[PDB]
Write a protein that binds this ligand. Structure first.
Ligand SMILES: C[C@@H]1CCO[C@H]2Cn3cc(C(=O)NCc4ccc(F)cc4F)c(=O)c(O)c3C(=O)N12
Ligand SMILES: C[C@@H]1CCO[C@H]2Cn3cc(C(=O)NCc4ccc(F)cc4F)c(=O)c(O)c3C(=O)N12
Ligand SMILES: [Mg+2]
Ligand SMILES: [Mg+2]
Lengths: 264, 270, 28, 52
DNA sequence: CGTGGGCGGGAAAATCTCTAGCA
DNA sequence: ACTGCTAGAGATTTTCCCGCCCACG
DNA sequence: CGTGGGCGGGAAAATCTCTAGCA
DNA sequence: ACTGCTAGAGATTTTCCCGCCCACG
């Protein structure tokens, strides 16, 4: 348990795997894996600027009727909505619906007139959503958004005989693109990828919210065969018989009788 | 037959007395007293006292229409996580509810619906849409709204937060969207301190993890357990080992999930 | 106080949040 | 590919595929699935709505 | 003169119970 | 062949902490 | 050959609970 | 200065009795 930390350290020196691999493989607590991936030099990539809130917005006018299409670009999930009239209130209503279903963090769109209303500004102020206009987050999926729109138009050309109304065939088409399109690495249709991304993001932000209070705390400690109260070290894992800390650069374990935790 | 027992019966014909009254007044055992109480066809009581169990499976969704300020609101709730969704209906009819159900099926892995016996929830359009999407339909007791009460409690909560949120927005449905956003994300508690939006992730994540791991392990591990049952010496088998215990394994022979002790067991590799 | 308490107050102004949600999201 | 004999009648490149497939099955995957399928289950019993 | 351990006083956290309302 | 259920408030039990002081190194 | 005691199987009695109704 | 309450049904626990049989006098 405690003697696998150094062989995770040399593993991160040779191959630089992330905290999940060293946590699940070596059966470690994930805090020491995040500190191993933190203490490295060349493993310090960029920040957030990954994101589960990669959302593309695109309008189209099919059969003389407005269809507003949103894409969860981090997982490739895509849906749409038939809009009767081009105004900012309809876009704000659909944006608040998307915020109600999924945690929409950032939206990417163009500088269209319908998407630049102050009603959408008040809605995103009440929501707290970063907004982008014309700027792709990364230029790989930029054409893929349009190709998915053409794919959905091919699905519409499949299922226009499956329903009478436009929006009923639209809902059947997004149901088909949610489930009836397989492939990939492990046979995921469309929902398993996005629930995997959302679950991993929820778990890593729970780890961030857990660790953001521990770094405020202090652990004054002495050792066995020692009364010299060193510290204040940083807590990693509070245990019932052994507490894990780091004083300067070493992952140490201590008895709880030798420990003293400042509450702030 | 004692004459006081027949006169107890006539007393019940005149007054419909208690069993304890006939037991005390004529020195009777309680069995014949409860028999005389059960004898009168007018002496019928208030029924039995225990509540049933509403199903908790991830493929079930509850749906109901409610009314507020002269408008109709369609609510759907996942049973295991409590993830909610609500809209304002133009008119109470089966086609718009079928469109709502098609949106729900396109956004979520829905297997089986369960509503009450309303008029809009019994349309032919809903039947055709559930046949198109392959959704098993089900309805409850026609005069018991308690099996569907789990969505009514959430309607109460929804209108309570609507009371808190009506002043911020001009229209009703904007505040309705704000309220469903608040309940799906901002309200924490329940099982493990999460909102319903996290539990609806975790339930489906366990759904598309655990049974796939089970499908991966069921082709590899195949142990044949012969068991000598209790009160007998017959070594019966083979059975499929579900999981190896420490003093008692669990197996299934044909359909019986049995906890058979390992000393009364015999595990074969193939 | 803390700035997270003030932002939890803004959360209470916008959504009327639970006590446990503000305690978990801001370590209160 | 084209010299087939032995026990199962495979060639060399197919017998090594089947042998290392059985090897990676029986090496760590059984222990990995049995050490990951321990989970946390909340539940209730009959005639009582209190979950345990 | 230099330390340890139980106690008590207080915080605080997990559970019991119990109710309002869904027409 | 079907089925009452769920969010919140004191209240009560269970449990760390700290300081301290009385008992001990 | 002449008794005792626990057991177990059944009756039966005290309590838990819980429910629906008072518009 | 005021206040939810009460009759009935399984259900479950607690407790005599009887017969009996196996253990003893
Ligand atoms: C027109 C359909 C046709 C079938 O019958 C009616 C009547 N009804 C009545 C209630 C109601 O009284 N809810 C409060 C409640 C009271 C006690 C309880 F144990 C559970 C509870 F939910 C509803 O909620 C509801 O949706 C209906 C409904 O839809 N319909
Ligand atoms: C005209 C006076 C003037 C004052 O107000 C009304 C209305 N009221 C209503 C009920 C009632 O709802 N009973 C059912 C019930 C429900 C719940 C519960 F806890 C207790 C219960 F008895 C009555 O019994 C009753 O007598 C009256 C009455 O007399 N009046
Ligand atoms: Mg209803
Ligand atoms: Mg209702």
């Amino acid at each position: 348990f405690l003697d696998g930390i150094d062989k995770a350290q040399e593993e991160h020196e040779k191959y630089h795997s992330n905290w999940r691999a060293m946590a699940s493989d070596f059966n470690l607590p994930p805090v020491v894996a995040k500190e191993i991936v933190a203490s490295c030099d060349k493993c310090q990539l960029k920040g957030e600027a990954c994101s589960p809130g990669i959302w593309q917005l695109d309008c189209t006018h099919l059969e003389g009727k407005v269809i507003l299409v949103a894409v969860h670009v981090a997982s490739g999930y895509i849906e749409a909505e038939v809009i009767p009239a081009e105004t900012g209130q309809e876009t704000a209503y659909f944006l608040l619906k998307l915020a109600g279903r999924w945690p929409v963090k950032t939206v990417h769109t163009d500088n269209g007139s319908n998407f630049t209303s102050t009603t959408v500004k008040a809605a995103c102020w009440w929501a707290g959503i970063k907004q982008e206009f014309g700027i792709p987050y990364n230029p790989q999926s930029q054409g893929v958004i349009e190709s998915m729109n053409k794919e959905l138009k091919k699905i519409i050309g499949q299922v226009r005989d499956q329903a009478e109304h436009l929006k009923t065939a639209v809902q059947m088409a997004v149901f088909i693109h949610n489930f009836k399109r397989k492939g990939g690495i492990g046979g995921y249709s469309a929902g398993e990828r996005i629930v995997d991304i959302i679950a991993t993001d929820i778990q890593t932000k729970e780890l961030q919210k857990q660790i953001t209070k521990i770094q405020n705390f202090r652990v004054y400690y002495r050792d066995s065969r020692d009364p010299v109260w060193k510290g204040p070290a940083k807590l990693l894992w509070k245990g019932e018989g052994a507490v894990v800390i780091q004083d300067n650069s070493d992952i140490k374990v201590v008895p709880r009788r030798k420990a003293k935790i400042i509450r702030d």
